[PDB]
Amino acid sequence: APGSGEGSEALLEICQRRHFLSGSKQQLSRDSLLSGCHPGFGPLGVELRKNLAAEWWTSVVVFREQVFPVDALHHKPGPLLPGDSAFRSGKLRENLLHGALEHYVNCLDLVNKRLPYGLAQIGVCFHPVFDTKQIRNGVKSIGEKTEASLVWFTPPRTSNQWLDFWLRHRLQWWRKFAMSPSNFSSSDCQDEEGRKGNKLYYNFPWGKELIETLWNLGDHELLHMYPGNVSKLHGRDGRKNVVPCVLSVNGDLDRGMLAYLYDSFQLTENSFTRKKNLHRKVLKLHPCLAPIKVALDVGRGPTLELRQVCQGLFNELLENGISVWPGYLETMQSSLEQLYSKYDEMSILFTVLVTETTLENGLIHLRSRDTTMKEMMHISKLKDFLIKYISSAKNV
């Protein structure tokens, strides 16, 4: 427990510092963090979640079938029959999926009515945290979380298999981006109705957490949405007629991400019972994972020529399609070592300090990246080795 607390400070503190979690205080504490009364994330915060959405998004988009709730609209003004108010608080989407539905029939016109696909996109929805009441006014507070909902209007047959198909895929995605993916299970805890669709979770330093979700509420809400004489269009099978099914949308959570930085450095215990205590650690993001790929560096003279061409690398780099931290500024603050430490505490892959050795030691892409491979790199090959880096790394 005390060791678990220390791991948390380590992985949290580093987040306040090194800017991954914009806001500070109690609204941040684990419990609150998870609820969402937090101020936010560092730029770093954004880059990762973006990479993610983006990275996760690519997979979703690929196969022969793919679409969007198209909009994602906080919205929802309206009275009675559609959604039923139960308790108190607000009017901001709670089902990225719901909207995805109106868009459904038209999504249906799409693909030639042919299809039995997955209609979805990404956006923010809001959660309230109301442990319990009595004290004063009432039903105050609000938490926020950016979700990903994939709906699918499936036949009676895509059915259990298509649901089960997802199980498969999703899981391989995580392991793919996981440093120790064994902390990503599924349960089938619920419902005496609608049957299956399992819940997902991560193994934090203090137990499991609910992440994504997955139901098969096959064709029950559309009937809800679009009443009929037992109406409308059923949807095509391929020469027959059927009313489309449900598609389980792991929600989101910024959390998936939240668990990754965990996984990475989560890796507390890592060296909790092994080697000498020089446990400085580093966070670890699969390369694609990390918000920043590298910290350009520059030292010595003339101060500028070197700050220059670092200037030089950045752009060239910037251009390529690589995230960077420009280290010209960098020569200013600190002393070499803590640079390393910060950076490692940052995940930024490698770092190259263009100094006297840089032109005047004519050439050299100066060393950094760990496991301490400070090998000299003629700047180019390597630069274009990193371009490779990403590619293979990404792939798996």
């Binding site: 391989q172 909790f272 061409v309 004519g362 050439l363 496991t371 180019s380 090959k381 080795f385």
Partner: protein, 1093 residues
């Protein structure tokens, strides 16, 4: 009827073919001897507390002496095939190698020639062979024929058929829809009148029989020429092996060594060599060329094949029936014609199956890759370009372009792909491709200024360091990206060479079993003897100046096994009883592990040479089961995996390696299983399947595959004759969960059908049972149901096995297996050995105590016996002499006394043909299985001349007999109306049959009854005239579209694939019980029981 009991209910089924309470148990002596006992073996007084009930009501049978009716049943099946075989056997017209031919048949042994094959053998009986390419397609390329005449096919016209070449995709993939179109010669002939049986040697003829059975209907039956051999002229596991070494290149070769060739050497002996085969192997691998060589020779292959068939055969029957039974023979006739369902799913159940092993490895790799990375580095020390660098540097090699010839001096128009280095063939290098743009630059500003100045700076940097033509033709970096090491070179499925990469274990810090060290990478493990010996790092002023000086990597490598040192020792008490590269124990000294010495079954230690500094190390055991060398591998299969799940193993601080060892542990089983599994490929039902809209009601995608695979179940095979399908007759649930941690389920699933089958418990233990009892006077007994005693008692008999371990208070699943083992061959040393390993420090002496004891308790009085083995006293007393049958019948030829037998001769088999025989035992048991050995724990059922073998085999040979009746009766009864369906199974103690859904309940009785009979019958011969209730009504008969023992299961695990039975297809349906089942069927059938349910 009644309820009578000088023992166990028997009632009124008997009246028809037996008597319930009718066994002439003789007065006082006989009834009393048995009773006097147990006062000593502690069973009676309370046995009179039973849960007795059953109400039996069945009239299906007729005969006098059930067996008399068994030989009859055997009679019908055996006869039609006896007749068609007869004529094939006495046939006069030998071989006729005409030119040769081409595809589908015709004939041609001729006054002149051939043809007329519009369709198949009107032959009435023949033999055949089949070849299949490394075009890997399990499909054909020629089939050889005798009595009438038949023929070769499309292999060799196939070779001019499309699609491009080898290893990717191609046409035979779509040749999977070839199956239906092909057949197996139709597959059949007619099923109209006499059906040609077929005598052949082994598999893939089993493949000619890969297509002859499959459509689910067919009265063709076969039988191995290799099986029978095993049966008559066969040899034991270890004896044959010793026999093999000395035999080709001393008593009674008459070797009869499985395969064909070595058997012909014994049956006939001439033209004895391999017409063909030096070829066909000098590339059971090269095709396109094949036809050429083929045309000329493939007729050869054929013929060679034929002789064998012919040579083993015309001589293989007679000696077989020289061991005379109708049943043994008929039961094996159907065993061969087995079946196995399958659906669209196998490949998928198998492919999802394949995806995981990777993930796993792929993952430990990164773990690995990373942990090793982290480690090595964090240790700031010494000087760069050496020491821990060496380690990190080897494993991680990449961005090289040095060599391998290829293209060079020839190649076409490069796409900026220009490998440098490249040495021998690659260097008729000429001018071109380097210059710069008019074109354009990207941004207006200092950027261009700078951007362009950078390349200048960079570009020149090239004219700067290294050599200039590497630039021409830029590299592209061979491979990888991160910390991984590449042996590749080898394609052979499922491989991960970074572990063989000695060193990984110091990484993956590992000691902890026998408690500690860390290990050395693959040999033994240090300890803490702060010597006062061993270590003289000591001093004085000398040490100061000189120690540092070092001289050799050693004082630096020594200093490391020394930092390593105090820490290993401190590090040991802390966990056991809980730095500039010389901090992490394993890694330092270990550099290069773990060195010479010997596995030498070293409970011991290494008398120096080895042995340095503060701690001593025990060159870790064991290796007998491995058999011949130094541990070599930490994850070494065998002992080591056992210890990973074992009580002791390492990865001290966190997830790390536990994850690792644990992970690999998961996949090991699958690696090897993997290949063999994926391999069966398969054939499928396209449209001409099960008709009647039968296809309709079942429910069915129609977008799925409904074909089936059939595995060669060696009729006989084994010296016990038990079975010969590594993969399929080696079925298992899933203790070490994961892919193929059994695909059993997927196995069967035809829509309109379901599979009736079941499990008889210790079908083997019980046989041993009555045997003794029956000869300890009244068959009631002692060990066996005397000692099995009425007992079940809530949980059950395992609770008895449990009794064996509790007295000696210990795990039972580990205790039960060894009795089985005790039951089988020897005892004494074997217990100590096995128990010891799986056990710990009590050492040989204490092991002795226990082994000797356990053996003492069930067989430990003077001369030979008391306790429990008056039966083995008989297995032994009846079998240390003459040759015999097993009181039931059939003979097991090779014999100690009997190998010896025309009296005492020739140094008496050296007197060590017998001592070399002293050496095989234990090893043989951990060897017995080629795939995995002794099995996984939680189940695990796997078991020169002399008792051991013989004794072990009696039980076994006799459980074979067992199988055949269950079968013979059932086959019989299916014929006997209420028709149902199929199969041979004979798997372990399981025997599954297929049925249409309806009459699936019908078969239930069949099985039920069939066992009663089997069981019944056993006693009469074996013991005499009677037997009990409990066995009679089994446990229950299982029905499901799935293939796992004890239905509700659900089989999560395959850890992957696991939505399973959710991931779906099927999901569990119960086995009725005996009482229930009868209720629905009510006195079996014709078409009479029918309506109501």
């Amino acid at each position: 009827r009644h309820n009578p009991l000088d023992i166990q209910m028997l009632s009124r089924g008997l009246h028809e073919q037996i008597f319930g309470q009718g066994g002439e148990m003789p007065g006082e002596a006989a009834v009393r001897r048995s009773v006097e006992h147990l006062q000593k073996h502690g069973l009676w007084g309370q046995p009179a507390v039973p849960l007795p009930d059953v109400e039996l009501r069945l009239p299906p049978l007729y005969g006098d002496n059930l067996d008399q009716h068994f030989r009859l049943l055997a009679q019908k099946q055996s006869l039609p095939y006896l007749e068609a075989a007869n004529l094939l056997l006495q046939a006069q017209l030998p071989p006729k190698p005409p030119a040769w031919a081409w595809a589908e048949g015709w004939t041609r042994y001729g006054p002149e020639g051939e043809a007329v094959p519009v369709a198949i053998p009107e032959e009435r009986a023949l033999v055949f062979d089949v070849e299949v390419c490394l075009a890997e397609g399990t499909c054909p390329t020629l089939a050889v024929a005798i009595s009438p005449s038949a023929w070769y096919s499309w292999c060799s016209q196939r070779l001019v058929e499309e699609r491009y070449s080898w290893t990717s995709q191609l046409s035979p993939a779509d040749l999977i829809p070839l199956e239906v179109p092909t057949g197996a010669s139709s597959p059949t002939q007619r099923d109209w009148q006499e059906q040609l049986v077929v005598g052949h040697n082994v598999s893939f003829d089993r493949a000619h029989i890969r297509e002859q059975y499959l459509i689910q209907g067919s009265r063709m039956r076969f039988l191995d020429t290799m099986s029978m051999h095993m049966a008559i002229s066969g040899l034991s596991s270890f004896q044959r092996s010793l026999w093999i070494a000395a035999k080709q290149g001393w008593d009674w070769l008459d070797i009869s060594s499985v395969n064909s060739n070595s058997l012909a050497e014994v049956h006939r002996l001439y033209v004895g060599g391999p017409p063909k085969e030096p070829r066909e192997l000098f590339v059971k691998g090269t095709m396109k060329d094949i036809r050429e060589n083929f045309q000329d020779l493939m007729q050869y292959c054929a013929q060679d094949v034929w002789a064998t068939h012919e040579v083993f055969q015309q001589q293989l029957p007679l000696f077989l029936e020289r061991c005379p039974h109708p049943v043994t023979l008929a039961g094996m006739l159907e065993m061969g014609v087995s079946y196995l369902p399958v659906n669209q799913n196998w490949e998928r159940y198998l492919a999802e199956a394949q995806g995981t092993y990777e993930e796993l490895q792929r993952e430990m790799k990164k773990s690995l890759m990373d942990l090793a990375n982290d480690a090595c580095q964090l240790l700031s020390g010494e000087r760069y370009k050496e020491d821990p660098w060496l380690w990190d540097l080897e494993w991680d090699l990449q961005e090289f372009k040095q060599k391998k010839a290829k293209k060079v001096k020839k190649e076409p128009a490069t796409a900026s792909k220009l490998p440098i280095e490249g040495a021998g063939a690659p260097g008729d290098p000429m001018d071109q491709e380097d210059l710069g743009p008019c074109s354009e630059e990207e941004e207006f500003q200092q950027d261009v200024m700078a951007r362009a100045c950078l390349q200048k700076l960079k570009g020149t940097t090239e004219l700067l360091p290294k050599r200039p033509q590497h630039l021409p033709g830029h590299p592209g970096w061979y491979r990888k990206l991160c910390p991984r090491l590449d042996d590749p070179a080898w394609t052979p499925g499922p491989s991960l060479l970074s572990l063989q990469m000695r060193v990984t274990p110091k990484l993956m810090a590992l000691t902890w079993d026998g408690f500690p060290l860390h290990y050395s990478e693959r040999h033994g493990w240090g300890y803490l003897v702060p010597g006062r010996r061993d270590n003289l790092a000591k001093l004085p002023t000398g040490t100061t100046l000189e120690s540092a000086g070092v001289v050799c990597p050693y004082r630096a490598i020594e200093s490391l096994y020394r930092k390593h040192c105090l820490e290993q020792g401190k590090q040991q008490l802390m966990p056991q009883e809980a730095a500039a590269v010389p901090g992490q124990p394993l890694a330092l000294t270990a550099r290069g592990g773990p060195k010479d010495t010997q596995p030498s079954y070293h409970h011991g230690n290494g008398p120096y040479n080895d042995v340095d500094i503060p701690g001593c190390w025990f060159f870790k055991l064991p290796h007998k089961d491995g058999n011949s060398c130094n541990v070599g591998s930490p994850f070494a299969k065998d002992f080591l995996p056992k210890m990973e799940d074992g009580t002791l193993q390492a990865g001290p601080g966190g997830a790390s390696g536990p994850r690792a060892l644990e992970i690999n542990k998961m996949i090991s089983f699958w690696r090897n299983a993997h290949k063999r599994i994926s391999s069966q490929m398969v054939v499928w039902l396209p449209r001409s399947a099960l008709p009647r809209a039968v296809i309709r009601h079942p429910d069915y995608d129609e977008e799925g595959l409904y074909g089936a695979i059939l595995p060669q179940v060696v009729t006989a095979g084994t010296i016990t004759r038990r079975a010969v399908e590594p993969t399929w007759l080696t079925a298992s649930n899933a203790r070490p969960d994961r892919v193929g941690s059994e695909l059993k389920a997927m196995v069967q699933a035809p829509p309109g059908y379901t599979l009736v089958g079941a499990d008889v418990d210790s079908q083997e233990l019980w046989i041993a049972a009555v045997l003794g009892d029956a000869h300890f006077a009244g068959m009631h007994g002692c060990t066996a149901f005397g000692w099995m005693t009425l007992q079940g008692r809530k949980s059950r008999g395992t609770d008895l096995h449990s009794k064996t371990a509790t007295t000696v208070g210990i795990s039972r699943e580990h205790a039960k297996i060894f009795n089985y083992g005790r039951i089988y061959g020897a005892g004494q040393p074997f217990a100590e050995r096995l128990l010891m390993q799986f056990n710990h420090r009590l050492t040989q002496q204490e092991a002795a105590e226990k082994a000797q004891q356990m053996y003492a308790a069930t067989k430990g009085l003077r001369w030979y016996r008391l306790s429990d083995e008056g039966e083995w006293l008989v297995r032994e007393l009846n079998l240390p002499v003459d040759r015999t049958e097993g009181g039931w019948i059939s003979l097991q030829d090779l014999r100690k006394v009997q190998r010896e037998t025309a009296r005492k001769s020739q140094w008496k088999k050296w007197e060590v043909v017998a001592e070399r025989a002293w050496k095989g035992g234990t090893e043989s048991e951990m060897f017995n299985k080629l795939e995995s050995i002794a099995t996984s724990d939680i189940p695990r059922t796997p078991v020169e001349e002399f008792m051991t073998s013989r004794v072990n085999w009696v039980v076994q040979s006799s459980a074979v007999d067992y199988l055949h009746l269950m079968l013979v009766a059932m086959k019989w009864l299916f014929e006997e109306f209420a028709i149902d369906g199929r199969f041979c199974i004979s798997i372990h103690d399981e025997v599954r049959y297929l049925v249409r859904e309806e009459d699936r309940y019908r078969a239930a009785l069949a099985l039920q009854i069939t066992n009663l009979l089997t069981r019944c019958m056993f006693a009469y011969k074996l013991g005499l005239n009677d037997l009990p209730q409990s066995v009679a009504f089994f446990s229950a008969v299982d029905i499901d579209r799935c293939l796992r023992k004890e239905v509700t299961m659900d089989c999560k695990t395959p850890s992957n694939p696991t939505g399973m039975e959710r991931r779906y297809g099927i999901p569990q349906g119960e086995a009725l019980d005996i009482y229930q089942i009868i209720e629905l069927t009510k006195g079996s059938l014709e078409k009479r029981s029918q309506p109501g349910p």
